[PDB]
């Protein structure tokens, strides 16, 4: 095991993000037992994960990791149980991981984080019901929005627009944000109120298209333009925790649920692949940049699974 790297990883795997070069970012929390904390791990050999002694780099966080995002190639931005957003910096040699900043702005657990298209700004969401806009360079809150009336489940920055991001809350609202507007939020979704929205993913190519998942296992395709719900499929028997698009020219949609299953869907939202591999909740998915047929899932069963997608 490397220096500054913990000789043991917490059981609950929260996040998995393949960088450009195919290196693996792992977030984990301790959700039970004496010590409720979290860890950040780097696996330049992804097939070695989750074993700690084969890791490139690892560090201990004060608290659990609710959410994670790569900031460029050396940056890790952390949503903490502590109500802190944490910026973690990679080593020159990438042997260790060191705290750039840890800011206690959220009055409750930080649930969700997304980096805006600049790489100089990020959006956080919390159980404190607020959404905050972060200046990563100056390590400060530019804006705090109480648009929602219950805990914020997800925030996803637009691929190419630094002022645009989606949010969803247990208040049953999906908000489309544009900080350039004086009233920056706009309530979007299906014409009919339905089940609580749980997960968000923009289309990587079509900047006005996104999918959301719900508490009832339904995945839905939305056009900002049509302001009407395009297509919906009942993919899961439990809430949709995550929605991830393939790096392919015509993307694939990876669906992850508390039903402990992975589903891979076409553009028409039809079902291509399904994995009962995990025997607890499936928390994240990343497609290899190297081989786009490879999909890596992590779960609370502490399984790092590598899928071969047709």
């Amino acid at each position: 095991l490397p220096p500054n790297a913990p000789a043991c990883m917490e059981r609950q795997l929260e996040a998995a993000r393949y960088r450009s070069d195919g290196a693996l970012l792992l977030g984990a929390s301790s959700l039970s037992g004496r010590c409720w904390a979290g860890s950040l791990w780097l696996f330049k050999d992804p097939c070695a994960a989750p074993n700690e002694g084969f890791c490139s780099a690892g560090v201990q966080t004060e608290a659990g990791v609710a959410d994670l995002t790569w900031v460029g190639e050396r940056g890790i931005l952390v949503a903490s149980d502590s109500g802190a957003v944490e910026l973690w910096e990679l080593d020159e040699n990438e042997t260790l991981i060191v705290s750039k900043f840890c800011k206690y702005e959220h009055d409750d657990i930080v649930s969700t984080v997304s980096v805006l298209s600049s790489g100089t700004q990020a959006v956080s969401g919390s159980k404190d019901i607020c959404i905050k806009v972060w200046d990563l360079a100056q390590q400060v809150v530019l804006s705090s929005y109480r648009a929602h009336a219950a805990q914020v489940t997800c925030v996803a920055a637009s691929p190419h627009k630094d002022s645009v991001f989606l949010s969803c809350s247990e208040d049953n609202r999906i908000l489309l944000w544009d900080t350039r507007c004086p009233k920056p939020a706009s309530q979007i979704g299906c014409s009919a109120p339905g089940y609580l929205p749980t997960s968000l993913a923009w289309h990587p190519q079509q900047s006005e298209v996104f999918v959301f998942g719900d508490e009832n296992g339904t995945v839905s395709l939305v056009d900002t333009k049509s302001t009407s719900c395009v297509l919906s499929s009942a993919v899961h028997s439990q809430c949709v925790t995550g929605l991830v698009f393939s790096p392919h020219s015509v993307p694939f949609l990876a669906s992850l649920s508390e039903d402990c299953s992975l589903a891979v869907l076409d553009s028409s939202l039809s079902e291509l692949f399904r994995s009962q591999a995990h025997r607890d909740f499936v928390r994240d998915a990343t497609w290899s940049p190297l081989n786009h047929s490879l999909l890596t899932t992590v779960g609370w069963d502490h399984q790092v699974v590598h899928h071969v997608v047709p």
Partner: protein, 625 residues
């Protein structure tokens, strides 16, 4: 001074966290008993077979710490009222699990949110836990003054905040509380943790909470301002509310992160202690009345019963009250004897119910003050108190005072009286039967004789107090009617309550009573205009008496005799609380009823809804003749 706790939703190590919050000066910690993000599956394989442990060990603290220093919190993913069946089922199971663990741990309290309107299934599950073994632990329902939907920034272009004001709408969080506690049948274990926001609502919205069982106030760091030296502080309005809450002796809870970074959370806490020690100090009455707040006591019946030595002692411990008596007699003597007849004229002064003699002494001080001449009879049916009197007259009064061991209704007086003096008044004035007693004695008063007191009047006012409704209700006893508790008055230092309308006179008596035919029976109809939404639980009673001319005693708040702690108010409960809407009138009816044997009160509310007549034929409560 102030009892406060820390609210946290992140506890990496319970030992370290607890030490921290103690170091900062917190009496207790509100924390999760399971990891807030650790959602559990109970029905579906494979997640249901998730290997444990399901949380951290009870061995990590002493039983004493668990019992005194910890308040548990329901996990936030638990939604028993979810419209998704599976989430409902899982939340039912997790809620029981977390509550059962709290009971396992011996936690003194457990926090549950009212964060929306429909908490029906949440209530059903809590009621089930409560009805699973008799336990003492409290449930703190975390309710905001202002619902989060009505707090949100107006930053949604196509969903503007309704800026148009709604009276009842702004009271929606009270209705959340009311429905929850009504479903749970006013369990004494279920109380309010009132969460305060940066934007305090209208006064009516705050007044909604007046008589409610508030155990805690939650103060987010967010609502605190910054002074010149950058210290956390509060708006004067926030401060007026804190001063209000200190009177209810609630526990304060600080929630959220330290927004005053170049300081520590002792800053927030020190501000509270600062306010507490800097609170407007309480009057001597409030110091007298310090232990008795909302304490239910039986009205004394000094006719039917022989009061104890220490009862007379407390009666005597009101120097203001006897100064008034001295002054009334002082004035009456000068009125009755001109200075020309000063030495030739000796007035026959009779004290009727003289107890241990304080009115005898006041009568004597009055006569020397007036420099006029008096002959004193001290009439007292309580032979134990006659012991005190006869020792006083042998040792001190001498033959000026004739002690009479007799009922004033039976006594054959050797002569007629110039002045009769009496302290036969309870908290509803005539509730100890001053009228019947004085009526019996009035044959031996001179045709021009004065009774001190000459007059007394009872007053009533409708009140709201879910606290006192519950305390009455808790007074069920074996071997009697299960609702008799509600058909009797209590003497009580009314504290946690809302007076719904100005007091109105109920019953009036005059002495002597020159009526050719005298009937002490009464029937009275009162209309209390109500300007708030509320729930009626009963009627506060008070009284005023005219000792002589302008000399009075009153426990009626508007005219309260200053510094006179001798009588707390009386309370007439009703069996079923009655909802009253702003604008509506409360119509109550009171009867004073009698036999040769007993006198009693009956009462009914007739508007906005009818109650049952309470205490028909004195079946639950009588006053012995």
């Amino acid at each position: 001074r102030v009892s406060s706790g820390r609210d946290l939703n992140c506890v990496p190590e319970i030992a370290d966290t607890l030490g921290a919050v103690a170091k900062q000066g917190f009496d207790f910690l509100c924390m999760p008993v399971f990891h807030p993000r650790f959602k559990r599956e109970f029905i579906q394989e494979p997640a249901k077979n998730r290997p444990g442990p399901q949380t951290r060990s009870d061995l990590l603290l002493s039983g004493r710490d668990w019992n005194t220093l910890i308040v548990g919190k329901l996990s936030p993913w638990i939604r028993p009222d979810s419209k998704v069946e599976k989430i409902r089922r899982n939340s039912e199971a997790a809620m029981l699990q977390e509550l059962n663990f709290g009971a396992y741990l011996g936690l003194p309290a457990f926090l549950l949110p009212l964060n929306q309107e429909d908490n029906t299934n949440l209530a059903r599950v809590l009621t089930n836990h409560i009805h699973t073994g008799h336990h003492s632990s409290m449930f703190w329902m975390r309710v905001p003054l202002v619902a989060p939907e009505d707090l949100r920034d107006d930053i949604i272009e196509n969903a503007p905040t309704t800026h148009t004001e709604e009276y009842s709408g702004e009271e929606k969080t009270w209705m959340w509380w009311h429905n929850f506690r009504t479903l749970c049948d006013y369990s004494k274990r279920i109380a309010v943790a009132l969460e305060i926001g940066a934007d305090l609502p209208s006064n009516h919205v705050i007044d909604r909470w007046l008589g409610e069982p508030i155990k805690a106030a939650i103060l987010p760091t967010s609502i605190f301002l910054t002074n010149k030296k950058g210290f956390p502080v509060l708006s004067k309005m926030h401060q007026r509310l804190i001063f209000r809450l200190l009177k209810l002796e609630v526990q304060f809870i600080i929630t959220g992160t330290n927004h005053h970074s170049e300081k520590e959370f002792c800053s927030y806490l020190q501000y509270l202690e600062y306010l507490s020690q800097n609170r407007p100090p309480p009057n001597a009455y409030e110091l007298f009345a310090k232990g008795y707040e909302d304490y239910l006591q039986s009205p004394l019946q000094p006719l039917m019963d022989n009061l104890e030595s220490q009862t007379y002692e407390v009666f005597e411990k009101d120097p203001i009250k006897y100064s008034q008596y001295q002054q009334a007699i002082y004035k009456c003597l000068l009125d009755r004897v001109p200075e020309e007849e000063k030495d030739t004229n000796v007035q026959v002064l009779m004290v009727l119910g003289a107890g241990r003699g304080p009115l005898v002494n006041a009568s004597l001080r009055a006569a020397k003050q007036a420099d006029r001449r008096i002959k004193l009879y001290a009439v007292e049916k309580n032979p134990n108190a006659v012991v005190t009197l006869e020792n006083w007259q042998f040792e001190e009064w001498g033959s000026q005072v004739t002690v009479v061991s007799s009922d004033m209704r039976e006594w054959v007086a050797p002569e007629k009286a110039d002045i009769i003096v009496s302290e036969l008044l309870g908290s509803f004035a005539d509730n100890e039967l001053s009228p019947e007693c004085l009526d019996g004695a009035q044959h031996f008063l001179k045709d021009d004789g004065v009774s001190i007191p000459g007059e007394y009047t009872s007053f009533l006012a409708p009140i709201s107090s879910s606290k006192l409704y519950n305390e009455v209700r808790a007074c069920r006893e074996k071997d009697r009617d299960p609702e008799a508790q509600f058909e009797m008055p209590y003497v009580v230092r009314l504290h946690n309550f809302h007076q719904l309308s100005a007091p109105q006179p109920c019953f009036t008596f005059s002495h002597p009573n020159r009526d050719p035919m005298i009937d002490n029976n009464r029937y009275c109809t009162l209309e209390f205009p109500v300007e708030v939404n509320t729930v009626l639980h009963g009627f506060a009673g008070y009284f005023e008496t005219v000792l002589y001319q302008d000399i009075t005693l009153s426990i009626r708040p508007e005219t309260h005799s200053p510094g006179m702690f001798s009588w707390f108010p009386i309370l007439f409960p009703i069996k079923q609380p009655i909802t009253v809407r702003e604008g509506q009138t409360i119509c109550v009816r009171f009867w004073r009823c009698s036999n040769s044997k007993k006198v009693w009160y009956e009462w009914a509310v007739t508007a906005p809804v009818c109650s049952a007549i309470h205490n028909p034929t004195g079946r639950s409560y009588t006053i012995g003749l």
